[PDB]
Amino acid sequence: YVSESEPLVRFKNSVKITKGDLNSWREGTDPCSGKWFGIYCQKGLTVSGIHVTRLGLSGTITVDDLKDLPNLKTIRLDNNLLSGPLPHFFKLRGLKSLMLSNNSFSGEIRDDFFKDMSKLKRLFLDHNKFEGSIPSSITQLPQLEELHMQSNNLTGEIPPEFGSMKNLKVLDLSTNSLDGIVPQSIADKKNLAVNLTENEYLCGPVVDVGCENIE
Amino acid sequence: IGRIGYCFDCARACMRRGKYIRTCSFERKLCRCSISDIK
């Protein structure tokens, strides 16, 4: 719908593009025309996905404008140069898929970051520079099917809540520096594809490692 | 003393417990074996 061109255009001005551009995002035109780079629409009527990939978006981003897209369900900002901590994605309540792979987002994500994002099914935070612990709110996402957080600078234990995530099918936390012992609940979980490799100090059930140093 | 030498001794230490070697660092004096037994 044409009204949906307003928030997108505002968003377009809130980012620094260094490869290609978004000149096809013309204010006053329906972003569902087919002419807007990177827009997916549901039934060709209302904006439901935004894909601004490989545009060299750099610096900080703000996403607040995007809360005015009622049917926004997927955002993909893969392969840019974004840095800073996570913007206010939690204001996008209906979001089903959030993809941030291959940027330089940083810091430790505050534990309650995801609390307001109850519709998330897929979450890709991989190949960034996140540090500290895995936020506990990720484990409380009732719809989460896939989580990829591989290739960050994460430390600390993996929360056992992961084992009691009804819909979780893919959990990739490889190549971090996650610590301590792997919760049994995680190994117990039915048909879960997990990858905890390249976390040197992890021990226990999934990595198949006795915790006892025999030296 | 030595680093790679340490991991070989870790490997052996693990083998005399029917376990595969898993984790080794000389600086941390940590040698860890698998929980599972050799197949």
Numbering used by the authors:
A (entry chain B): 26 to 240
B (entry chain C): 13 to 51
What does the paper say about this structure?
Orthologs of LURE1 in Torenia concolor (TcCRP1)15 and A. thaliana (AtLURE1)9 were recently shown as key attractant molecules, indicating a significant role played by these secreted proteins in pollen tube guidance. By contrast, our data showed that the LRR-RK PRK6 expressed at the tip of pollen tube is an essential receptor of the same attractant peptide and important for targeting of pollen tube to ovule in the pistil. Sharply contrasting with other LRR-RKs, AtPRK6 recognizes AtLURE1.2 through the C-terminal loop of its LRR domain rather than the LRR portion.
The AtLURE1.2-AtPRK6LRR protein complexes in the two crystal forms display a nearly identical structure. As predicted, the structure of AtPRK6LRR contains six LRRs that create a slightly twisted solenoid structure. The N-terminal segment (residues 20–52) of AtLURE1.2 is completely disordered, whereas its C-terminal portion (residues 53–89) adopts a typical structure of plant defensin peptides characterized by cysteine-stabilized αβ-motif (CSαβ). The C-terminal loop of AtPRK6LRR is mainly responsible for its interaction with AtLURE1.2. AtPRK6LRR-AtLURE1.2 interactions are both shape-complementary and charge-complementary, resulting in a total burial surface of ~1226 Å2.
